[model samples]
Target: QALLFPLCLVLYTFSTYIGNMMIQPGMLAVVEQYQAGIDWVPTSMTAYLAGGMFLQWLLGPLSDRIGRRPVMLAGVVWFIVTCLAILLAQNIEQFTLLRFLQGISLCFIGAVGYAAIQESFEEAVCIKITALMANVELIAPLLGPLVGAAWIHVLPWEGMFVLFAALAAISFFGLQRAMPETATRIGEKLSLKELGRDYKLVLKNGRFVAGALALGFVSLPLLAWIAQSPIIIITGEQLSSYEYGLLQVPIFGALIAGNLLLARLTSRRTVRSLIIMGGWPIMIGLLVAAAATVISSHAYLWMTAGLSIYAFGIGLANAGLVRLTLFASDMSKGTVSAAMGMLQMLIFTVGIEISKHAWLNGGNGLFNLFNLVNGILWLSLMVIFLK
Candidate 1:
C-alpha cells in the first residue's frame, strides 16, 4: 500500500507532462495530413494549458464533495477516451480542441490526486513523496520528444495515442487496486455558494497567494526552456531532433539529482530552511544564464549550463514551497490545491507568452526573462516573510 499508492500517483501525473511534448515530434505529419498552418502546432500546447486553467476550479471542489477515487478513475478514463479520439480529429482545430479536453485530466490529477497525497500521509513523508514524484515528472520532459521521434519512425504519428491509451489502461487498473480513499468529507453537499466561499477563504490568505506565485515563478524558467528548446536548440543551434533531446539530459539530469538530494535533506530540514537554501543556487544560475547571452559563440552551451543549475534549485525547493502554499489555508485540501493550480497556470500562460514575445523581439529574451521573473519572485518572498 505504501509503495503502490504514490507509485500510482506518479504514473498518473507523469502522463500529462509527456502528453505536452510528445505531439511536437508529430507536428509535421499532422500539418501535412490536414493541410493546416504550422502555427497550430504550438497552439495545441496552448489549448492544453488553457484546459487545465479553466477546469481545475470545478474539479477540485467536485472531488472534495465526492471522493478522490471516483474523480481520478473518471479522469483516467477520460484521458484514455481522448487519446483515442485525437486519432479521429478531422482538422487541426479539432485536434487542438481535443488537446484542451485531454488537458482537463491533468486538472483532476493536480486538484484531486495531489490533494489525496497531502491528506494520506504525514507531513514530512508527504513532502518526500512529492519530491520523488517530481523526479518521475522530470523523466517525461527528458524523454518524451526522443520517444515520440522514435514512435514516428516506426508508426504513424497517431500510434503514439494508442501507446498513451495502453499506458493509461495500466495506470487505471493499478489505481483501482491500490488507490485508497483519502478525502475526509466525501458525500458532503457542495454548491456554488460554498465553492465560492472556499475559494475566497483561500484567496484571502496573502501568504498562500505569494507562495503560489512563487511556485509558478520558480518553475517558469524550466517550463520556458522546455517550450523554446525546439526553436532555440534545434533551429537556432542547427541541432537535430535527437540532439535536442540529448541536450535536455544535463538540465533535467541535474533536476533529478537535486530532488534526490532534497529527499535526503527533507528528513532533517525544515521546509523553510530548504526553500531558503535553494534560493541561492536559483539566483546564481539565472545570473549566469543571462550573462551567457552576450557571447554569441558557445552561448547555447553556457545558457544550458545556467539553466541546469537553476533546475537543480527548483528540484530542491519546489516540494517545500508546495507544502507551504497548500497548508496556508484551512479550506479543503482539494480546493487549496485547485487554487494553487489556477494561480500556477495563470503565471505559466502569461509568462510563456511574455517570453514568446521576448523571443520575437530579441533572441536572448528567454534568459533575460528568467532574471526578471526570479527577481520579482524573490521580492514577493521577502515581503511575505519579512512582514
Candidate 2:
C-alpha cells in the first residue's frame, strides 16, 4: 500500500508537469501575439480556471460515490483528448476552448489523486506521505518551464500541446497498470442530496472557512508572480523566455528546500510555529520587492528574490494549513479532499484573474497592490494568533 501510493504520486507529479507547462509562458506569448488587446485573451485564463474549479465540484463527490481508480482513468482520457485538441488549435477561439476543456479534464486527476493518497495511508503516516507528495509535486513546476522553453525553441507553440498529449497518454496507461482502487465500497453511493448537505456543512464551518482563506491569501503572491513574471522578465527587462525559465530553478529549488526544512523542524516545532516563521520572510521579501519597483531599479532581481521567498513560505504553510482545514470535518476523507480541491481551484482562479488585470495595467501599481493586500492579510492573522 505504501509503495503503491508513492509510485502513483510520482507518476501523477510527472503528469502535472506536462499539464502546467504552458500556463505562464503560453499566456504571455498569446498576449504578445495579440498585442494585449481584446479582453478575451485574459478571459481565456479565467475560462480555464473556472472549468477546473467547477469540474472539481462535480468530480470529487462522484469519485467518492464510484471509485478513485476509474475516475482517475476517465480524467486521464479526457486530458489526452483535450490536449490533442489544443495541439490542433489554430486560432485564439480554438485555443481558449481547448484550454477550458483541458482544465476540466485535469481536475479529475487532481481531486482523485489527493483522496487516493489519504485513503492509502494511515493518519500517523499522513504527514510523511503528504510531505512526500508535495516534494514530488514540486518537481513539476521546477521542470515545466525548462521543458516549455526547449519545446518553444524546437517547434511552434502547438508542438508543446502535442508533447503534453503524448505524456498524458503514457500516464493513462501507467495508472491503469499500477494504480489500485483506493476508495472503499462503504462510501461508494451517489446521492445528490447528501453532496449538497456536505457542502452546506463545509460552508458553515468557520474554522474551515478561515483556514481556506488564509491558505488562499498565502497563495496570492505566488499567483501574482505567476501572472506577472513573464511580463516583468520578457518585456520589462528584455530577457528571453529561456532565461526566465532558467531563473525559476532557484525559486522552485527554495520551495523544495523549505519543505525539507519544515519536515526536519517539525520534530521540534509545532506546524503553526513553522508557518509563522515561514511567512515572515515572505512579508519582508514583498516589502523589499515593492521598494525596488517604486524606484524602478533592480526590479528583476528583487522580483525574483521576493517570489522565491514567497514560494518557500508556501512550501512551509501548505501542508500544515491543509491539515488544519481537514481537522474535525465530518465528511469522509474523499469528500473532504474533494472539497479542499474545489476550494483551492476557486481561490487560485480568482487570484490569477486579479493578477492578470494587474499585469495588463503594468508598473508599480500592481506590485504595490499585491504587497498591501497580502501584508494586511498576514498581519491580521498574526493579530488573531496573538489574541
Candidate 3:
C-alpha cells in the first residue's frame, strides 16, 4: 500500500495535468472539427482551470464528511467518464463542458488526495511523497504535448482520451485497493456557513492577499504562454504540430531547470532572497522576448529563448511564494490552501482572457506586450509585499 498508494496519487495528478495540456497540439483540429472560431481555443484551458478553482471548497469538506477513498474513486470515475464523453462532443460547447468536468479531477487530488497523503503517512514520508508527486506533475507539461502530437498522427484527438481513460482506469483500481480512509471524524456534517466564514477569514488577511496576488501575477506569464502557444506557433508561424511540441521544450525545460536550481539553494537562501533573485530573470526574459519580436526575423526562436529564461525564474520563485502565501493565515492550513488555490486559478483565468484578446487584436507583438506587463505587475506586487 505504501508504494502503490502514492503511485496512484501521482498518476491521478499526472493524468489531470496531461489532459489539460495534451489537447493543445490538437486544438486547431478540434476547432476545425466543430467549425468554431479559432479564437475560442483558450476557453478550453480557462474552463479547466475555472472548474478546478471553484470546486475545492465543496470537495474538501465533502471528503471530510464522507471519506477520501470514496471521493477520490468517484473523482477518477468522473474523469474516466469525461474522457470518453469528449468523443461524443458534437459541438465545441459540449467539448468545453466535458473539459470542465475533467478539470474537477484536479480538485479531488488537491483537496482530497493531498489530505489523505498527509493523514496516511508519517511526517517525513509525507513530505517526500508530496515532493515526488510534484516532480511527476512537472513532467506532464514537458511530455504531454509530445505524446498528444504523436497520438494525433495515427488517431484523432479522441484517441488521446482513450489512452488517458485506460490510464485512469488503472489508477482507479490501484487507489480503490490501496487508499485507506483518512478521515477520523467521518460523520461530521459539512457546514456551508462555516466554510464561508473560514474563507472570509483567510481572505481578510492583508499579508496573505498580497503574497497570493504576487504568486498569481508571477505565474501569469507562464499561464499566458501555455494558453496562447498553439495559436502563436501552429497557426501564425505555420509550424507542424510536432514542431509546436518541440517549441514547448525550451520554455518548460527552463522551468524544470530553475526548479532544480531552487532545490540546491533552499537551505542557503531565504524566501525573499530567492524571490528577489528570481524576479529579475523574469523581467529580463520578457524584455528579451519583447525586443525579439521587433528586431528579429526568426521571431519564434528568440521569443522562445526569452520565455525560457522567464520560466526558469518562475521555477525559482514559485515554491517560496506558495509557501509564503499559504501559511500567512493562522486559520486552518487546509482552508488556506483551498482559498489560495482558487484565487490563483481566478487570476490565471482572467490573465488568459486578457492575453487572448490582445493576441486577437495585434498578434504576437501585443501578446508579448501582455507578458511583459504582467511580469512588471508581479514585481510591483512583490515590492508592496516587502514594504
Candidate 4:
C-alpha cells in the first residue's frame, strides 16, 4: 500500500517521458507529414522543454499553498487532456503547442511529487525511496524510444500520444484512490510576492545553492550525451536505431547499479563520503572515454564502455544530491523542488544547444564537452559539502 504512490508516480513519469521519445523513431515520418522538415523537430523539443519549464517556479509555491495531491491531480489531468489534444492536432504548430502544455503538466507533476514524498516520509526512508525512484525515472528515457518504435509498428506515431493519455489516466485513478494529502499547510495564501520572498531566502542559502549546482553541473555530460546520442549513434555512425537503442541499456544499467550501491552504503557512510567516492569513477570514466575518442575505431564498444562508467559514477552523485538540496532549504519542499527543476531545465537547455554545436564539429566536439564537464566536476567540490 505504501509503495502504491511511488509506483504510480514512476509510471506517470515514464508516460510523460514517452512524449519526448515518441518522435525519435518516427522523425522521418513527422518531417514528411509537416512542411516543417527535420530541423523543426528539434525545435519542437525546445518548445516543450523550455516553454513548459518557464512556468516551473510558480507550481511549487502553488502546491505548497494548496496541497500536493490537488496540484498533482490537476497536473496529471492536464497531461491527459494535452495527450488527447495531441491526437487531434492537424499540423506541427498545433502538435508543438500541445506538447509545450504537456511539458508544463509534467513540471507540476515532478515538483509536487518530490515535495510530497519529503513531506510524508521519514528522512532515511525517503532517501532510499528517492534513490529507487531516480532509477525508475532514469530508465524511462532509455526505454522510451524503443517502446515508441514498437508502438509505431502497430499504430501510427499519433498512437504514442494516445498511449500516454491512457497512462496518465491510470496514474490519476491510482492517485485518487491511494494518494493522501501530503502538504501540511493548507491555510497559507498562495501569492507571487510570498513566493518571491521564500525564493530569495532559498537562493541566498549557500549550502543549498551549492548542492543543487553540484548535482546539476555533474549531470551536464549525461544530458549532452543523451541529446547528441541519436545523432552520434544513428546519423553520424550509421547504425540502425535498434543498435543505438540497445547501447542505451548498458548506460542506464550502470546508473541503476550505482544507485543500488548507494542504497547499501547510505546506512554506513555519510552522503558526503558516498558522493566523493562516487566522484572518482566519473574522472576515470572521462579519461577512458577521452582515450577512446582518440584511439578507437569501433564507435559502439568504445562509446558504450566510456558512457557506462560515467553513468554509474554520476548515479552515485545523484543518489544524495537531490535529497540534500531539497531538504537543505528548510522551506517548502515544493518551492525548493520547483526552483531546482527550473535551474536544471535551464542548464540542460543550454547544454543541449552546446551539444548540438559540438556534434556539428564531429567526435572531438564530444571529447571537448566531456573535458569541460570534468573540469566543472572537480571545481564543484568547492561548493558541495555536507551542509
Candidate 5:
C-alpha cells in the first residue's frame, strides 16, 4: 500500500500535467491547427478546470456510497476514453469538451485516492505518503512542461494526448490489479438523504470547516501563480518554453529538500504544533517575494528566488494543513475531500482571475497582489493556536 497509493498518485498527476502542458508547448501549433482564436484557448482551458472542480462534489460522495475502487476504476476508464477523444477533436469546441470530460474523469482519482490512503494507512504513514504525494504534485509543474517540450519536439501536437491515453491505460490496469475497497460505509443504506446527512455532519464540525478553508486559503496564491506563470515567467521574461522549464529545476530543488524535511517534521507532529512552527518560514518567504519584486520585476532568478522561498514555506505548511483538514472528519472522508476540492478550486479560480487583472495592469500590480495574498496567508494562521 505504501508504494501503491503514491505510485497511483504519480500516474494521476502525470495524467493531469500532460493535459495542461499539451497546450503550452507548441501552443501556436495547436491554436493554428484548430484555427482557434485567443479567446477559445483560454475558454477551453477554463472548461477543463471547471469540469475538474465541479465534478469533485459528486465524486467524493460517490466514492463514499459505493467504494473507492469502483469510482476510481470508472474514472480512469472514462479518462482514457476522453484522452483518446482529444486526438480526434477537429475543432476548438470539440477539443475543449473532450478536455472537460477528461477533467471529470481524472478528478475521481484525487478524492478517492485520499480516502484510500486514510483508510489503508496509519496516521504517520498517511502523513508521510501525502507529503510524498504533494512532492510529486509540486514537482510536476516544474517537470511537466519540460516533458511536454520534449514531446512537441518529436511528436505531432495530437501525440501528446495519445501519450496521456496510454498513461491512463496504465492507471486502469494498476487499479484493477491492486486497488481495494476502502469505504467503511458507516451508516444505513446509501441514498441522497443519507448523503445529505453525512455532509451535514461534516459541515457542522468546526475543525473540518477551518481545515478546508485553510487549505484553500493556503493554496490560492500558488494556484494563481501557476495560472499566470506562462505570462509572468515565459511572456514577461521573453524566454523560450524549454528554457523557462529548465530554470525552475534548481528553484524547485529547494522545494524538494524543504518538502522532505516537512514530511519528517510532520510525521510525529500534531497539526497545531506544525502550524505554529511552519507559520514563520511562510511569512519570511513572502517577505522575500516582496523584496524580489522590488529588486527586479523582470530578472529571472530573483523572481524565482522569491517564489521558491514561498514554495518552501508553503511546502512546510502543506503537510500540516493536509493532515489537519483532511483528517478533520473521521467518518466522511469523501465529503470532506469533496468540500475541500470544491472550495480550493473556487478560491483558486477567483485568485487566478484577480491575478489576470493585476498582471494586465502592471508589474507593480502583480507584486502588490503577491504581497496581499501573502498577508492573507499570514492572517489565516491566527486561527490556529500557538501553544
Candidate 6:
C-alpha cells in the first residue's frame, strides 16, 4: 500500500497536469483566435467542467461493478487518445469536443484513485495516507501552470496537447504494470438495479448530502480563483504567463504549509474541530479579497495573497472532510469513495460554472460578486456544520 501510494500520487499529478495544461491556456487561446467575447470564453470553462462532473457521476458506479483496474486502464487509454485529438484540433469546436472526452477519462482516475486509497490503508492509517495523497496531489496544481507556460512560450498552444498526450501514454503503461485491482468487486458484478438503488440511497441520505454541500460551499472560492485568475493575470494585469506561474509557487507553498499544520494539529483534535478551524482563515481570506476588489489599485497583489490564504484553508480542511465523509458512510469503502468523488466533482462543476458565467459579464464588479458570494458561503458552512 505504501509503495503504491506514491505511484498513485504521480499518476494523479500527471493526469491533472495534462488536463490543466490544455484547459487553462487553451481557453484563452480559443477565445482570442475566434474573437470570442469575454462572456463566451468564461462560459466555456463551465461547459468543460460540466462534462467532467457528469462523467464523474457515471464513472463511479461503473467502477463499482467492473473493478478499479479495468476502469483505470480504460480511462488512461481514452485520455491518451483524446489528448492526441486536442493536438490535432483545427478549431474551437474540435478543441471543446476533445476536452469533453478528456474530462470523461479523468473522472475514472479520480473515482478509482480515491477507492484505491481507502482500500489500501487501514482506518488507523487513513489520515496519514490521506494527508500524503493530498500533499502529492497539491504538487500538480503548483506545477501545471508552470509547465503550461513553458510550453506556450516556445510553441503554439496545441503543443501543450502533444506534451500531455505523451505523459498520458507513459502513465498508461506504468499503471498497467504497477496498479493492482483494489476494488473487492472481483467477480461479483453489481446489477443495474442494485447500482440504481445505491445511488438513490446516496442522494437521499441527509447527512451525506449536507456534508457534500458543506464541502462544496467551502470549496467555491478556490474554484472561482482558478477560473478567473488566468484572465486577471494575463489580461487584467498584463502579467506574462511565466509571472503568473511564479505567483502560484508561493500560493501552493502556503497550501503545503497548511497541510503540514493540519497533520500536526489534527493529531489530537476531531475532524469536525479541524474543519471548523479551517473555515475561519478561508472566510477571512475571502473578505480580504472582497476588500481588494473594492480597492483595485493593487488588485493583482491583493488577489494573489488572498487566494493563497484561501488555498491554505482548503488544504487544511480537505483531509478532515474526506476522513469524516468516509467514516460517516455505511456503504462498502469502494462505494463510499465513489460517492465522495461524485459529490465533489459535481459541486466543483457547479461552482466553476457559476464563476465562469459571472466572469464573462465584463468588469471587476462581476469578479467581486463572485468573491462576495464565496465569503458568505464559507461563513454559512461554518455556522451550520461547526455547530
Q: Could you report the Cα RMSD, in angstroms, for every candidate shown?
A: 3.3, 3.2, 1.5, 3.5, 3.9, 3.2
Taking all chains together, each candidate's TM-score versus the true structure is 0.85, 0.86, 0.96, 0.83, 0.81, 0.86
| Runs of candidate 2 exceeding 4 Å displacement | 1-9, 29-46, 120-132, 177-179, 182-190, 328-331
Clashes of 3: 0
lDDT of 6 by residue, 66-157 (tens): 78787877877777787676666756666667666676665765667666657676776677766555655676666776776787678777
Local accuracy of candidate 1 as per-residue lDDT tens digits, 32-108: 78876544445566678778988788877677777878888999999999999988886776887888899788878
Measured by TM-score, how close is model 4 to the native structure?
Answer: 0.83
* Predicted structure with the largest TM-score when compared to the true one: 3
Q: Can you write out model 4's per-residue Cα lDDT over 1-387, one digit (the tens) per residue?
A: 487877788778777766776555555456568777444444555566776577788866667778888788888888888888777776877777876787787666566877777778888978887766665577677677677666756777777777778888888898888888867668985456877787778889887777666666677667666655655676667777578778777887888788788878878898767776787777666656666666454455766677788789877766676777788888776678777777677666665665566556555546445555643654564344652
Q: Which portions of model 3 miss their true places by more than 4 Å?
A: 295-298
The pairs that clash in candidate 6 are none
Q: Which candidate is the best by lDDT?
A: 3
Question: Mind giving the per-residue lDDT tens digits that candidate 5 earns over 1-387?
Answer: 247656775687767765675455445456668884433433444566677786676666667767778777787787778777677777776776777776676467577767677777889978877756665577566677677667777777777777777877776677777776868664536566765676778778777776676666665556555545555565556677677776656656756766777768767877676666666656665566666666466665665666666667666766566766777778655677777777666656555555556666666447445555744654564555232
Ranking by TM-score: 3, 2, 6, 1, 4, 5
Considering summed lDDT, which 10 consecutive residues are worst modelled in model 2? 34-43
Cα deviation of 196 in candidate 4 (Å)? 1.6
lDDT per model vs. reference: 0.75, 0.66, 0.83, 0.70, 0.65, 0.67
Model 5, CA-based lDDT: 0.65
List where candidate 6 sits over 4 angstroms from the true fold: 1-9, 38-48, 114-132, 176-190, 295-298
Which 10-residue window of candidate 1 scores lowest in summed lDDT? 37-46
- Clash pairs for candidate 3: none
